[PDB]
Design an enzyme around this catalytic site. Structure first.
Site, PDB file in Angstrom:
ATOM      1  N   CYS A 105       1.220  -1.142  -0.135  1.00 29.68           N
ATOM      2  CA  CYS A 105      -0.322  -0.167  -0.300  1.00 29.68           C
ATOM      3  C   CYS A 105       0.790   1.471  -0.130  1.00 29.68           C
ATOM      4  CB  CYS A 105      -0.761   0.174   1.104  1.00 29.68           C
ATOM      5  SG  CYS A 105      -2.183   1.101   1.616  1.00 29.68           S
ATOM      6  N   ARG A 108       0.174   4.254   2.826  1.00 31.88           N
ATOM      7  CA  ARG A 108      -0.111   4.634   3.768  1.00 31.88           C
ATOM      8  C   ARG A 108       0.206   5.227   5.088  1.00 31.88           C
ATOM      9  NH1 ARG A 108       4.049  -0.902   5.086  1.00 31.88           N
ATOM     10  NH2 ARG A 108       4.189  -0.257   2.745  1.00 31.88           N
ATOM     11  N   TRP A 277      -9.444   6.091  -1.356  1.00 30.74           N
ATOM     12  CA  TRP A 277      -9.604   6.549  -2.388  1.00 30.74           C
ATOM     13  C   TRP A 277      -8.605   6.000  -3.593  1.00 30.74           C
ATOM     14  CZ3 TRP A 277      -8.348   9.737   1.921  1.00 30.74           C
ATOM     15  CH2 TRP A 277      -7.799   9.841   1.928  1.00 30.74           C
ATOM     16  N   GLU A 282      -4.065   3.491 -10.623  1.00 31.49           N
ATOM     17  CA  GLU A 282      -4.946   1.991 -10.479  1.00 31.49           C
ATOM     18  C   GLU A 282      -5.624   2.473 -12.041  1.00 31.49           C
ATOM     19  OE1 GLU A 282      -4.625   1.289  -6.196  1.00 31.49           O
ATOM     20  OE2 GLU A 282      -5.406   3.044  -5.628  1.00 31.49           O
TER      21      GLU A 282
END
Ligand code: HEM
Ligand code: HEM
Ligand SMILES: CN(C)CCc1cc(F)c(F)c(CCc2cccc(N)n2)c1
Ligand SMILES: CN(C)CCc1cc(F)c(F)c(CCc2cccc(N)n2)c1
Ligand SMILES: C[C@H](O)[C@H](O)[C@H]1CNc2nc(N)[nH]c(=O)c2N1
Ligand SMILES: C[C@H](O)[C@H](O)[C@H]1CNc2nc(N)[nH]c(=O)c2N1
Ligand SMILES: [Cl-]
Ligand SMILES: [Cl-]
Ligand SMILES: [Gd]
Ligand SMILES: [Gd]
Ligand SMILES: [Zn+2]
Lengths: 401, 402
Positions: A105, A108, A277, A282
């Site tokens: 991630c 973070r 979000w 992505e």
């Protein structure tokens, strides 16, 4: 203690936190498997002791009063019944830690600001659906997105499992064809098969929001149509390429992952959908351009009049940047929280610095932190990272069927 | 037992059985992956040499034959008598090719079999070393039609110091530390630049001054050698449709010739064995020119392009960098100098991967190095899981001689 270097600046740190690594990963001294996506009962007390000790350390209250006491209850709870219940605050602090521990991630920096909805008293697919619907509407928040996780009841032996049969709460349909090819999202082709199977009417669209498939213990799934006002979507337009809108592209606002097992203190929550979000890449790069996803890249190149005949024109790179521009431009115009890969990676470096002084390092999976376009233009590219597994954690799990 | 490896683009699955024969150990453990880190006696000499000779005789389909057993005993006898052994010429050619083939960070290995091996194991001095290098540069450059070449200087051996090339590459641009802490030229080459000056090189003050060679013969200090100007083919950078780009004064050189790595073959170590191929355009355009710690031209380019550099969401960085890579490809093709773009190169590496699975049951590949630094997931290697491991013969890093 691994020496870790930043090559942009020359700085050196040591990952002392790595020594605490829990569930070993896939790599051995003889071969590295870091690039692989999915890595190749009374001792529940060990993982409960560990998490509780974590919890009380984080409130500057180790070895004082209530810490000792809470050790005995879980001892007694497991001694009596075999499993145990988390205090509500522990569930919150563990949901945050598992996000903090997610090596892949890049978001973070936000880990401390997470809204945990407690659904541990849920009991069936209609109850789930309303929990899921409260999450979606809270998280979406008219486009001012907020990190949220809804924690459904933990697993215990001899009885079934709460599961969401979709990888995300919002998925587009994948419709196989009279010739194998797919209209819609090919990543979802299969959960479209199961939704069609259990009674859903297949649309004719590249962007048909799939229904949900929610499963209460021991019972088969049950389809749930999502309220079309709850599914906030963005049509994709480009600030200067007037024809881009005409491609009829869209994506949803809310990335909500509904298939990962949340694991806190030895407890397993196979239903604990989380959401934050989107980072624009992505959407623009992976979802819209991956050759096995919407695979639009060559279509945008034709529209841009680019020479697709030779790869040395870099027509792929040019069209991919304009797709990402469109994604960011559209979410901004639609007033939906989105973050570009440069802002995101820069905040991840800031997070690395925070984690360095706070916990002595940070589990990071370089291949997933580095954006899928413009990798070396972002600072994370030049940052060596150490990958390992800490608890609490989000873990992958087998699909329920 | 063997890692299962997925290609996510096509859905394909392979098992890397070759990984199980990994001749040495990497930096990872089950605790922790370190795959992103850039820098991760007669008995063991015997067993490495024995393994390499077995490989060599497999490739020529003479496994377990008479010639094969004679060579083992020959090597065992020479290790007993001298503490070392000598490669036959054909074993050397095979060992250099294998080392390229086995290099996990190299996306250009579809070419591994087409390698030109120059045997310089008779080299005697730094002056002869310089002549061998000049002929390597001349042959590999080939007037812009580049050919892959390695020149192998004498092996490490007891009683003698090493041949070493101090320069990390045969062609490098000087980095002149200025007094601010700012660097004029290539900041990666500040150290070697200072060494050259300390060894008597008269510095220039440009941004693309080609560095002299620092050549170290056994047990001698390094000796400075100026490369003849007409041997260093350079490419002025221009852009096909951004004409102010040529006024940046940017240039790069034709020949990427790595000169500081150690070639290891059957236990023998060659600390001096420069190899060269041809550039992939992202090495120049993205890494060398846009890295913040290198020429760092990104912002200046984006400003000239009239991109909005005050917000990241305009993606000015991505737009500027794409055009810098366009400029590199255009400039080299205009100059008739071999260059491969990251799309053509990653696609040929996929074919390499398929050839190697059939030939050896896998291929060592370091995903973070195989995936290009821009447009990563638009290339097919991105969606290919990879297994990283150390096979020998091999190129290895070594400490700088200073
Ligand atoms: C708030 C802003 C966030 C951003 C910008 C962000 C971005 C990302 C990205 C780009 C990935 C790469 C994985 C992929 O795309 O397949 C990722 C992975 C992941 N994130 Fe986040 N995320 C955010 C919030 C969250 C939250 C709230 C959670 C959980 C509480 C979370 C948990 C995870 C996990 C478990 C993974 C790894 C899962 C996988 O690799 O498939 N993230 N994140
Ligand atoms: C002929 C075309 C070639 C191409 C396009 C190519 C491409 C590349 C690239 C892009 C890298 C990563 C560079 C970096 O950013 O560090 C690399 C690494 C490497 N290449 Fe190749 N190469 C070629 C020829 C060769 C040859 C002829 C050899 C040796 C005989 C070789 C051996 C290596 C080694 C050992 C590395 C790893 C060093 C490192 O990653 O730091 N390559 N190659
Ligand atoms: C190829 N890629 C599209 C795969 C999609 C995918 C699969 C997963 F299992 C997964 F956890 C995530 C995380 C995406 C995510 C989560 C939370 C916030 C955010 N902004 N993003 C994404
Ligand atoms: C700055 N960063 C890009 C790393 C520089 C670097 C360090 C190395 F040791 C190294 F072997 C190579 C390989 C470069 C290369 C070799 C042959 C052909 C080619 N086309 N390229 C590159
Ligand atoms: C720290 C990080 O792993 C490092 O910058 C690596 C990443 N991948 C790379 N890939 C290539 N081709 N060349 C490099 O120098 C690097 N650097
Ligand atoms: C093979 C490679 O590890 C694989 O394609 C990974 C790389 N990085 C990724 N990064 C994200 N965000 N999502 C992915 O699916 C992947 N896939
Ligand atoms: Cl997604
Ligand atoms: Cl280079
Ligand atoms: Gd047109
Ligand atoms: Gd122009
Ligand atoms: Zn590893």
């Amino acid at each position: 203690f691994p020496r870790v270097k930043n090559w942009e600046v020359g700085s050196i740190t040591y990952d002392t936190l790595s020594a605490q690594a829990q569930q070993d990963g896939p790599c051995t001294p003889r071969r590295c498997l870091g690039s692989l996506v999915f890595p190749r009962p009374e001792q529940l007390l060990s993982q409960a002791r560990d998490f509780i000790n974590q919890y009380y350390s984080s409130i500057k209250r180790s070895g004082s009063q209530a810490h000792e006491q809470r050790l005995q209850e879980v001892e007694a709870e497991v001694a009596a019944t075999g499993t145990y219940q988390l205090r509500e605050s522990e569930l919150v602090f563990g949901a945050k830690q598992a996000w903090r521990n997610a090596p892949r991630c890049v978001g973070r920096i936000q880990w401390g600001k997470l809204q945990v909805f407690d659904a541990r008293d849920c009991r069936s697919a209609q109850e789930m659906f309303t929990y899921i619907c409260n999450h979606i509407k809270y998280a979406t928040n008219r486009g001012n997105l907020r990190s949220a996780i809804t924690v459904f009841p933990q697993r215990c032996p001899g009885r079934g499992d709460f599961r969401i049969w979709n990888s995300q709460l919002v998925r587009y349909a994948g419709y196989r064809q009279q010739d194998g090819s797919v209209r819609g999202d090919p990543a979802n082709v299969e959960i479209t098969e199961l939704c069609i199977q259990h009674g859903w009417t297949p649309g004719n669209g590249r962007f048909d929001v799939l229904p949900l498939l929610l499963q209460a213990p021991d019972e088969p799934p049950e389809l749930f149509l999502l309220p079309p006002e709850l599914v906030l979507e963005v049509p994709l337009e480009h600030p200067t390429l007037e024809w881009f809108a005409a491609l009829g592209l869209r994506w949803y606002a809310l990335p909500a992952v509904s298939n990962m097992l949340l694991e806190i203190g030895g407890l397993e929550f196979p239903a604990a959908p989380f959401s934050g979000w989107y980072m624009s890449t992505e959407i623009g790069t992976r979802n819209l351009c991956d050759p096995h996803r919407y695979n639009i890249l060559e279509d945008v190149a034709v529209c841009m009049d680019l020479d697709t005949r030779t790869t040395s024109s870099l027509w792929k790179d040019k069209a991919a940047v304009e797709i990402n521009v469109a994604v960011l431009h559209s979410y901004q115009l639609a007033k939906v929280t989105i973050v570009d890969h440069h802002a995101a990676t820069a905040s991840f470096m800031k997070h690395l610095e925070n984690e360095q002084k706070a916990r002595g390092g940070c589990p990071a999976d370089w291949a997933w932190i580095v954006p899928p376009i413009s990798g070396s233009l972002t600072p994370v590219f030049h940052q060596e990272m150490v990958n390992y597994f800490l608890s609490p954690a989000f873990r992958y799990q087998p699909d329920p069927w």
